[model samples]
Target: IPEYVDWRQKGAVTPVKNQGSCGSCWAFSAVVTIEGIIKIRTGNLNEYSEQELLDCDRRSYGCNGGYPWSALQLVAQYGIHYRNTYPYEGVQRYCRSREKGPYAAKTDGVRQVQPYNEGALLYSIANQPVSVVLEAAGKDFQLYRGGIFVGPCGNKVDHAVAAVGYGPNYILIKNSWGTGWGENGYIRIKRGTGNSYGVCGLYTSSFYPVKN
Candidate 1:
């Protein structure tokens, strides 16, 4: 079983991402995990291209919901585009789902798995680093003056993000809501009680872990 841990509230940041309403949550998941992977692996919090994964890997979304397995497959197949290659153009890019390479990121299969009722999700990053997942928490976004997670839209993962590291009080989370959104679209959720708004709709990476 996955255990719960916390890293206190400390305003951390990266840029914000906007994935329009294309339902490409899997791409976002892959991107966030890659952010963590890069951060931990190379100590770089560079945002990989969600559009790159979206327009390339066509076996991730529209299946049910992807967790982390789909992300892994993409990294293994065509790899990823650089963050500067295709900017995260804020939730409203009109690119079709059949484009890949430098300008379009796409993938299929592995529906966005809403990890409901799980303690926490842990998975590997593709060409990057970090175990990633979405968590539904009770932290109120109303009074949240920073980039933090909260209970919203009736307690479901109405959002997507990445978890970088943790200490003993809070969890460092990065949001895709855009830098103009909140705390540069980054925040920290209290581990036990602070993360009450963690709507766990895990848009995990694309690799299924093997077990004995």
Candidate 2:
């Protein structure tokens, strides 16, 4: 609500993650949100399995373009296992167990933020990391090494990342492209531009998970 608020500085974000050379960005996005919520709710930030979704969530095609909502649906149906148990191989694997890792944290549900509403997006992130989609294949985006990114982003949803917080001039982003890319696996984009459409249509579609 204020001009400056950061969830990362408040201990909400988990360790930066690398999705590797996989089309499973959607899973990573959803899992990170789930991790954040679980941490906020219970103070336990356990790693979740992207590989489990990659292998089991038939609603979202494995290693192909997927949707966060689809992955969330699978997570709701069959609780996700911890990374220690399921692990991430960055490739599709055989189904392990729908009910493994008896001690791993599980998501209770997820709520999609009001679409195309930056105000709602910010409100959501004030509580936890929110998964937002954006066009990230542009040359400017691919080689983005630092700074608050602005302009030159096309209107296409091709990648998934988490909006961790906001400040006076930028929204802090946690990307799944690995720690080697974009400010050590993070990015800052122009905030409060007075345009409902966030950079690269990020506000068009967003959601976050809840672990109760």
Candidate 3:
């Protein structure tokens, strides 16, 4: 394992985006993973549609919040649309028609890191950005401005984000809360903290897309 890795600097990650007031973070997390894998595989960084997952994925609750793993399954079945064609509205709406022409990206399926294992999470991040969930209901996370987040947070995961990189003692994550939220829409959480669930329960439920 390298000492540091950041997919954003390698053109695999898209610019930071805002999820607005909606609870559609799972959709954003899932789409970013697909986008990152597609970029790494094809050397073309194209933005896929989070709105497509939000509006079309019936397994998920849309703005009411859902799981990233379930969202990945939806992508595997129907692929996903382009953000230019299916822009994000940040609200729950009727499922749109799927008679579109070309899809922005598609995944064979998803693969999960070993539950409660930071080593597995780190190995996965060495390859591509990963979709992960964590506890974000605390004020420390909500009010976070910058710096490595070593928090008094809980292990009950409630929000989804994408793990994009890692350093010696911190795992870098990309948030859908926009660039003004934390280190320009990113947060570095203390890693290898001797907790099985990892900082903020990040190691509990982590996944990445598989394209081939």
Candidate 4:
């Protein structure tokens, strides 16, 4: 396997997005994964609508927090709209179920990486960006500006993000807190921490969409 992988360099990742004060990171994570996979498969890096998930997917709470697994399942069942078409409001709104446009992307199914296995997570990122959940409610994580983060945090898994790439010792994660957050809306968490759950329980809940 390659020692380094960055989907941004491959022209798959889109610009950073702001989830605002809303707890819609799960939708952002799920949509980013789908966007990356669609680019990998079709050479079109189109931004899908996270608002679509926040408004439509009833399986997960809209702004009160949710799971990427539920959002991915929603996408697989009913394809998603483009960001330009549907747009983001950063708050939970009524689902626009009647408006039907050409889908920006679609997934055949959802897949999960082997829990607590860093190798599995790494392998998955090499193929495409993966949806991951981790603890981000801590002040340290909230105030992070840049550099490789060696968390003084726990494995409580409160936030969702996209694992877009990795280096020899850090996992490059794309957050939904916007470009003002860290490394232009990204954070590098130290890997190989010898913790089976990975830095902040990232290895515990990792998933990706399967494209056909």
Model 3 spans > 4 angstroms off: none
- Where model 2 places Cα greater than 4 Å from the true spot, the runs are 99-103
lDDT assessment of candidate 4:
0.91
**lDDT tens per residue, model 3, 76-95:** 87788878888889988776
After superposition on all CA atoms, how large is the RMSD of candidate 4?
A: 0.9
Each prediction's TM-score against the native?
0.55, 0.93, 0.97, 0.97
- lDDT string, candidate 4, 1-212, tens digits: 79999999999999999999889999999998999999999999999999999999898899999889989998888789889899999999988845756566779999989899999999999999999999998889999999999987899999999999999999999999889989989999999979998988888798899997
- lDDT (Cα, tens digit) per residue for candidate 2, span 89-208: 989877776556453655677789998787888888877888899888889889899999986787587898888888878888899887888899998988777767678778878988
lDDT on C-alpha atoms for all candidate structures: 0.45, 0.82, 0.90, 0.91
Poorest 10 consecutive residues of model 1 by lDDT?
A: 4-13
RMSD for each model, in Å, please?
Answer: 7.3, 1.6, 1.0, 0.9
- Candidate 3 has a TM-score of 0.97
